[PDB]
Design an enzyme around this catalytic site. Structure first.
Site, PDB file in Angstrom:
ATOM      1  N   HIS A 121       0.764  -1.232   0.056  1.00  0.00           N
ATOM      2  CA  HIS A 121      -0.030   0.128   0.068  1.00  0.00           C
ATOM      3  C   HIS A 121       0.967   1.371  -0.029  1.00  0.00           C
ATOM      4  O   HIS A 121       2.209   0.973   0.485  1.00  0.00           O
ATOM      5  CB  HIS A 121      -0.961  -0.175   1.261  1.00  0.00           C
ATOM      6  N   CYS A 163      -0.234   2.244  -4.601  1.00  0.00           N
ATOM      7  CA  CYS A 163      -1.137   3.511  -5.164  1.00  0.00           C
ATOM      8  C   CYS A 163      -0.264   4.524  -4.665  1.00  0.00           C
ATOM      9  O   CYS A 163       0.545   4.638  -3.819  1.00  0.00           O
ATOM     10  CB  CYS A 163      -2.427   3.625  -4.194  1.00  0.00           C
TER      11      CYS A 163
END
Length: 274
Positions: A121, A163
């Site tokens: 992430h 991301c």
């Protein structure tokens, strides 16, 4: 010179199966390319293969009919040892600064090449880790600047799946460190799983989570099926960019002079791909 690699899954939990599957697969690709285990340092929390939720105990796959990618993967830094402090020590080749884990580090020489792959992430200027604290991009860049000051590698390539992953390097990674980096997405943009329930190509029905991440499987599946003596980093980037746009926008940072180099200089060469 010697090829080194550091492979990092920044997350944990069965819902994040894909990031550790990506890292296990990357290990398999490097092993087919002839990199040695002593030069491949693996960071993965390691809660997936024997997960209570895993429908194939002991096995990890990174595509729907893929081979097991878990078998053989070194357990250098797992569980509570997957930390920013250990990653720093490893990258800097400093076994005395390691706390817990195998003690394997990138004690590399000036003539050596280094490949870094991270999957998990991300947020603005920040990457996840499965233990506190998370990895701030400025701190990662400061470790790379220090490694460059130490003079202990020739060139380095960084592939980063998260991301907002462009935000890890945009504005802060200098272009003169002989480090070329690509990222799954732009600085303010989300990156995507692939082989996910409900979207073809989908995983087998026993899997309720994605098996992989699109940008990661793009480079890996490209690498294990092409002669890497003939393919350049530029050609790989173009193919990965195209596959990932599906999507998100793959970005590049750092020393773009590295792009014409043949991929095998970093990932090795599999004789079977001739």
């Amino acid at each position: 010179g010697t090829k080194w690699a550091v492979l990092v899954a920044g997350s944990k939990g069965y819902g994040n199966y894909r990031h550790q599957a990506d890292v296990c697969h990357a290990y398999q690709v490097l092993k087919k390319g002839g990199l040695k285990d002593e030069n491949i340092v693996v960071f993965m929390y390691d809660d997936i293969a024997k997960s209570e939720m895993n429908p194939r105990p002991g096995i990890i796959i990174n595509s729907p009919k893929g081979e097991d990618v878990y078998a053989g993967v070194p357990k250098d830094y797992t569980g509570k040892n997957v930390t920013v402090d250990n990653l720093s020590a490893v990258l800097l080749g400093d076994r005395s600064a390691v706390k817990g884990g195998s003690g394997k580090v990138v004690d590399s020489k000036p003539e050596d090449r280094i490949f870094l792959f991270y999957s998990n992430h991300g947020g603005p200027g920040v990457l996840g880790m499965p233990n506190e604290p998370h990895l701030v991009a400025k701190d990662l860049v400061d470790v790379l600047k220090k490694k460059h000051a130490m003079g202990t590698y020739k060139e380095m390539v960084i592939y980063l799946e998260a991301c907002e992953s462009g935000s890890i390097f945009e504005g802060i990674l200098p272009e003169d460190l002989n480090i070329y980096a690509t990222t799954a997405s732009g600085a303010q943009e989300n990156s995507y799983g692939t082989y996910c329930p409900g979207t073809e190509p989908s995983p087998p029905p026993e899997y309720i989570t994605c098996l992989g991440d699109l940008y990661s499987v793009a480079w890996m599946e490209d690498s294990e099926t092409h002669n890497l003596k003939k393919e350049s980093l530029e050609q790989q980037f173009n193919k990965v960019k195209k596959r990932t746009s599906n999507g998100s926008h793959v970005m590049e940072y750092g020393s773009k002079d590295i792009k014409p180099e043949k991929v095998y200089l970093y990932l090795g060469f599999d004789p079977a791909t001739v």
